[PDB]
Amino acid sequence: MWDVIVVGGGPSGLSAALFLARAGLKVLVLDGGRSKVKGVSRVPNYPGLLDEPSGEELLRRLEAHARRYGAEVRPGVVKGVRDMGGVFEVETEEGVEKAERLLLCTHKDPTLPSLLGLTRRGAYIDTDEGGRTSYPRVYAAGVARGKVPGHAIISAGDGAYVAVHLVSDLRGEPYKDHAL
Numbered sequence: 001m002w003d004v005i006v007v008g009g010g011p012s013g014l015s016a017a018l019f020l021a022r023a024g025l026k027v028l029v030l031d032g033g034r035s036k037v038k039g040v041s042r043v044p045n046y047p048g049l050l051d052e053p054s055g056e057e058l059l060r061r062l063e064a065h066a067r068r069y070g071a072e073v074r075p076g077v078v079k080g081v082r083d084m085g086g087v088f089e090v091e092t093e094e095g096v097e098k099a100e101r102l103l104l105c106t107h108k109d110p111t112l113p114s115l116l117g118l119t120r121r122g123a124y125i126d127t128d129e130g131g132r133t134s135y136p137r138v139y140a141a142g143v144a145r146g147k148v149p150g151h152a153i154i155s156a157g158d159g160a161y162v163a164v165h166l167v168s169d170l171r172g173e174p175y176k177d178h179a180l
């Protein structure tokens, strides 16, 4: 079982996983390997990354960062999602995984949003300021919820933003992941 299952392992999904894991949650990221940044030979505008790595390298570092604090990042394509009342069942080609909350960081792909009958805002998933969709316990972040035009740093920032508010809901208090 999982506290949260993040669908999509691009900047928003991996950033979300990092914050969720650091909050001590059991988080699993299922990614289909079609991040829009994967083919970039050199990302020159991710504030702070002065070596300007390729999109492929950036993804590797983001996955490492999330795994570093407990997140599990696995390749997989979600094709089914069933609400079983209290737990969501997510299905890939490899099998089924269960989570109480789902966070969609699926970029522009309307597949899963349509499966859940999520309310839309134009071509994107409709959400409140914090990323909560029209479906209870289902969240969205990054390009998936309209943070466009899409850029790596913007999606990463939103993934963390939504994750922080997801954690805040669970702890009933404004959650901050700060360090000395």
Ligand SMILES: Cc1cc2nc3c(=O)[nH]c(=O)nc-3n(C[C@H](O)[C@H](O)[C@H](O)COP(=O)(O)OP(=O)(O)OC[C@H]3O[C@@H](n4cnc5c(N)ncnc54)[C@H](O)[C@@H]3O)c2cc1C
Pocket: 007, 008, 009, 010, 011, 012, 013, 030, 031, 032, 033, 034, 035, 036, 037, 038, 039, 040, 042, 043, 044, 045, 046, 076, 077, 078, 079, 105, 106, 107, 109, 111, 112, 141, 142, 143, 144, 149, 150, 151, 152, 153, 155, 156
């Ligand atoms: C040619 C090109 C060049 C670019 N150059 C830059 C640049 O220099 N700087 C910059 O900041 N941005 C750049 N971008 C844009 C940037 O890559 C995106 O804004 C960013 O990747 C968006 O992050 P995201 O997390 O929202 O989605 P994405 O990174 O697109 O990730 C979505 C992920 O979810 C997965 N997914 C979707 N559906 C499922 C499913 N059902 N099951 C499992 N996994 C699923 C996908 O396979 C994918 O890995 C470029 C884009 C392109 C196309």
